[PDB]
Every structure is written in structure tokens, then in C-alpha cells.
Amino acid sequence: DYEIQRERIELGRCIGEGQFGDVHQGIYMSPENPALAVAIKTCKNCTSDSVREKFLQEALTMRQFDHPHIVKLIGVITENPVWIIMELCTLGELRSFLQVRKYSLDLASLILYAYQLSTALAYLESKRFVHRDIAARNVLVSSNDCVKLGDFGLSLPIKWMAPESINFRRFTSASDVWMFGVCMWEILMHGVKPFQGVKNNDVIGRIENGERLPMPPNCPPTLYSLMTKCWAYDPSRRPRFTELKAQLSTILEEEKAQQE
Ligand SMILES: Nc1ncnc2c1ncn2[C@@H]1O[C@H](COP(=O)(O)OP(=O)(O)OP(=O)(O)O)[C@@H](O)[C@H]1O
Numbered sequence: 179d180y181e182i183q184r185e186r187i188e189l190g191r192c193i194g195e196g197q198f199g200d201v202h203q204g205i206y207m208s209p210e211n212p213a214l215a216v217a218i219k220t221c222k223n224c225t226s227d228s229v230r231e232k233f234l235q236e237a238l239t240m241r242q243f244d245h246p247h248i249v250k251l252i253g254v255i256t257e258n259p260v261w262i263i264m265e266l267c268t269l270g271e272l273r274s275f276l277q278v279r280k281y282s283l284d285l286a287s288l289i290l291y292a293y294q295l296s297t298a299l300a301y302l303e304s305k306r307f308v309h310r311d312i313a314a315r316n317v318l319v320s321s322n323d324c325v326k327l328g329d330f331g332l333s334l335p336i337k338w339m340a341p342e343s344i345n346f347r348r349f350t351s352a353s354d355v356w357m358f359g360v361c362m363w364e365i366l367m368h369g370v371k372p373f374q375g376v377k378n379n380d381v382i383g384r385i386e387n388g389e390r391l392p393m394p395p396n397c398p399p400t401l402y403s404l405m406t407k408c409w410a411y412d413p414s415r416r417p418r419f420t421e422l423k424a425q426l427s428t429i430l431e432e433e434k435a436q437q438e
Pocket residue numbers: 193194195196197198201217219236249264265266267268270271316318328329330331332333
């Protein structure tokens with residue numbers, strides 16, 4: 179149902195480098211309809227079945243999900259060169275998009291990106307799916323008003339991880355919230371990395387002493403308080419995505435009214 183014939187795909191520009199291979203933009207075309215822009219994840223060592231299985235695992239996972247703010251799987255070509263065909267988010271990785279548009283993107287748009295990701299994550303939470311790596315690097319940009327979660331198949335990211343994940347390797351719905359807190363901070367920091375210039379081991383000890391990422395310049399205090407809740411040391415004290423979504427919706431409306 180998801181297998182694609184590769185003569186229906188034409189590779190275009192290399193739009194990024196992935197863990198397994200280059201990612202290319204391109205087009206999927208079937209006789210009647212668009213003109214579907216697509217991303218094509220390639221896998222250079224795919225002939226090794228060990229890497230192929232780990233490569234296609236992303237597509238298998240993405241397949242379970244159907245949400246406006248989660249990257250859609252379009253198909254796979256499972257003959258090597260093994261390719262994963264997915265929805266093209268033309269504007270690319272969120273981080274870079276934020277760094278480049280540092281002084282052209284309103285606060286309203288930043289919170290909207292936070293909000294849109296809280297809807298994707300509420301949805302994943304509803305399916306009891308634990309993502310494990312919520313980070314700006316894992317968000318793709320569809321339009322200036324649309325952001326999408328993209329990272330399945332995964333990986334060390336100590337500065338994004340909940341204490342219990344670093345320490346005990348425990349990955350839960352509550353740890354995803356911790357990471358979403360950090361992702362929100364990254365967005366408000368215009369794609370700046372957390373704890374930059376601090377050793378991973380120093381972050382660990384700081385966190386345990388009550389220390390947290392500072393309030394971003396121009397961050398609403400209401401939004402920083404929300405981030406602070408995501409970073410409760412005790413995972414059980416962390417909010418869930420239903421509450422984060424509702425509160426981001428409310429923070430968003432008030433920023434829109436803050437200039438009218
Ligand atoms: N669906 C897409 N639309 C647009 N650009 C993409 C898409 N997927 C990947 N890219 C680009 O290619 C780069 C590699 O993305 P990729 O998801 O392979 O990162 P990875 O760490 O290798 O994999 P994962 O995020 O699944 O762990 C991204 O940073 C982005 O620049």
C-alpha cells in the first residue's frame with residue numbers, strides 16, 4: 179500500500195544530510211494529479227540489512243500517525259537504493275529557519291510553532307507514543323504559519339533530555355514534556371542551542387541544583403512559567419500535553435491581542 183515505483187520519482191537537490199544518507203527534494207508523479215513535491219531520504223549503506231532495517235524503521239513508525247503537524251509518509255522504495263518518500267516541508271529544519279528569520283519573525287509566530295507542536299504531541303500522547311527526541315532540530319517548517327514534527331527512527335542529546343532519561347534511560351510521556359519545554363525555549367531563542375558552552379556533565383549537575391534555562395529575551399513571563407513546569411525534576415509534577423496545548427492557545431491569543 180506504501181510501496182512506490184521509483185520511475186515515478188525524480189531526485190532533485192540535496193536538501194540535507196541524514197544519519198543514513200543524503201536527503202533530496204524531488205517529485206512524485208502519477209499520470210493524473212500534481213506535481214507532488216517530496217523529500218527523498220536515501221540510505222548509502224542500505225545493502226547492509228542491519229542498516230536498512232534501522233533505516234526503514236522510521237517509515238514504519240511514521241506510518242502509524244495521521245496529524246496536520248506531523249510529517250506524513252508518502253511511501254517507500256524497498257529495493258536498494260532504499261528510499262523513504264515523505265511530505266516535503268519546503269522551508270526545512272526549524273532551527274535554521276529561526277536563525278535566518280531572527281529579526282523577521284514575530285513572537286506570535288514563535289508561540290504558534292510551540293502551539294502547533296503541542297497539538298502534534300497531544301495527539302502522540304493520545305496514542306501512548308513516546309517520541310524520545312523532541313528538539314527544534316527535529317521540527318520541519320512547511321510555511322511561515324506551519325511547523326511539523328518529523329523525527330522518527332531517532333538519535334547523547336543530554337542538554338534536551340529529562341534527568342531520568344540521562345540517568346536511568348527512562349523514556350516516558352513525562353520525559354517528552356521535559357524535552358518539549360527545551361524545544362519551546364529553543365524556538366523562543368531563535369534556534370539557539372540550550373546550555374551552549376557547558377559540558378554535558380555540568381548541565382546534569384546544574385539541573386539537579388534547581389538551575390534551569392534562562393527566560394529568553396522577549397519571552398512572555400507566562401510562557402517561561404509554562405516551560406518551568408515542563409522542567410519539574412519530578413516527572414509526575416510535569417504537565418501533560420492536553421494542558422500545555424490549552425495554555426499555549428491562551429498564551430497565543432494574548433500575544434495577538436498585545437498588538438491590535
Ligand atoms: N520531509 C522533509 N522535508 C524537507 N526537508 C527535509 C525532510 N526530511 C529531512 N529534511 C532535511 O534533511 C535533513 C536530514 O533530516 P533527517 O530527518 O534525515 O535527520 P536525521 O537525524 O538523519 O533523521 P531523524 O531526524 O529521523 O533522526 C534535515 O535536517 C532537513 O534539513
